[PDB]
Amino acid sequence: GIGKSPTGIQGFDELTLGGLPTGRPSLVCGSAGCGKTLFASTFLINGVR
Amino acid sequence: VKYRGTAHGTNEYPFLIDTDGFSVLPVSALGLLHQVHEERIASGVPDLDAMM
């Protein structure tokens, strides 16, 4: 197995089987208005809180 | 397409340009808050009216 960092989003976390990889870069692609900035924001907020 | 800072409608809303100008009657604004009345209306047919 590999390390994983939960992102607060329960559905996404259980879809990824733990969350985004820990210590590795993750890419969030999508046109304007898809929600990449909010994705990153909740990532950080949930990680801290 | 993108409104930063708060929620908003995301569907495509058909609008019209008329004498007033822009008019938008979104189908998402309808709500089920209808005051009911206890009065009755007359259809004009006595038999049909008495049937109920």
Ligand SMILES: Nc1ncnc2c1ncn2[C@@H]1O[C@H](COP(=O)(O)OP(=O)(O)O)[C@@H](O)[C@H]1O
């Ligand atoms: N309070 C809110 N409630 C629901 N949706 C919101 C709210 N605030 C922002 N959004 C959504 O976030 C979107 C923009 O997110 P953002 O990631 O900052 O832009 P982009 O997706 O271009 O990176 C808006 O299009 C809007 O639908």
Ligand SMILES: [Mg+2]
């Ligand atoms: Mg953005």
